[PDB]
Amino acid sequence: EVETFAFQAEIAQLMSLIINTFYSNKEIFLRELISNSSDALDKIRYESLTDPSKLDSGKELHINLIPNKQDRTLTIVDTGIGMTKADLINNLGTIAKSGTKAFMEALQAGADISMIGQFGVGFYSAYLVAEKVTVITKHNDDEQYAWESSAGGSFTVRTDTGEPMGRGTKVILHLKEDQTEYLEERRIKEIVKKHSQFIGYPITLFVEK
Numbered sequence: 001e002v003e004t005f006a007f008q009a010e011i012a013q014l015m016s017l018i019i020n021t022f023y024s025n026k027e028i029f030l031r032e033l034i035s036n037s038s039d040a041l042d043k044i045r046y047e048s049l050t051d052p053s054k055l056d057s058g059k060e061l062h063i064n065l066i067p068n069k070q071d072r073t074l075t076i077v078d079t080g081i082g083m084t085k086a087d088l089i090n091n092l093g094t095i096a097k098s099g100t101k102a103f104m105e106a107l108q109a110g111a112d113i114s115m116i117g118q119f120g121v122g123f124y125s126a127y128l129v130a131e132k133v134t135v136i137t138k139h140n141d142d143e144q145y146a147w148e149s150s151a152g153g154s155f156t157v158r159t160d161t162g163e164p165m166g167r168g169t170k171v172i173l174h175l176k177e178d179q180t181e182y183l184e185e186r187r188i189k190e191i192v193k194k195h196s197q198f199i200g201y202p203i204t205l206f207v208e209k
């Protein structure tokens with residue numbers, strides 16, 4: 001049972017700016033998604049400081065990068081706090097309407113797309129490299145859901161019947177055909193060392209074959 005939703009106008013315009021602008025420094029998407037994961041991991045560690053049973057759904061706090069060349073996908077898994085259904089619908093837990101207002105003022109006043117993370121909407125930089133993004137998520141207080149969008153002004157949300165997650169968020173990037181470099185081992189390593197050396201959680205890059 002799939003529900004289809006319209007993006008708010010300001011979000012749809014942010015995603016088409018990201019899809020259509022000529023901007024070569026596309027590798028920042030990964031920095032942005034890892035930093036979102038690290039923020040959700042901070043949130044569940046804070047909650048467990050007073051209630052330890054909030055880690056009954058998994059005590060390990062980590063980030064995994066899983067390239068898959070046959071599927072042409074890059075997946076970013078974290079065991080962070082996760083999103084409820086209401087977070088998913090509400091622009092994936094962000095204040096995206098006002099953050100796009102600020103961001104897209106800054107672009108006309110000096111800034112460039114690489115500062116998108118300073119406005120709370122870094123998730124959407126995923127569309128620099130992906131034609132389609134799927135977010136599987138499980139929050140302790142809700143069921144597991146799948147959010148899905150190929151841009152074009154709409155997204156879908158459904159109950160995910162697949163592999164139980166325990167707790168966390170899985171961002172699946174279905175990459176554009178000319179962005180396959182972000183599936184190679186040495187290119188991902190180079191981006192993680194460049195932009196994410198101080199993330200306070202173990203980032204494991206899986207290998208293939």
Ligand SMILES: Fc1ccc(-c2cn[nH]c2)cc1
Nearest residue numbers: 036037040082083092093169
């Ligand atoms: F409210 C939220 C909770 C978790 C996340 C997230 C983003 N990447 N991984 C997890 C985003 C919003």
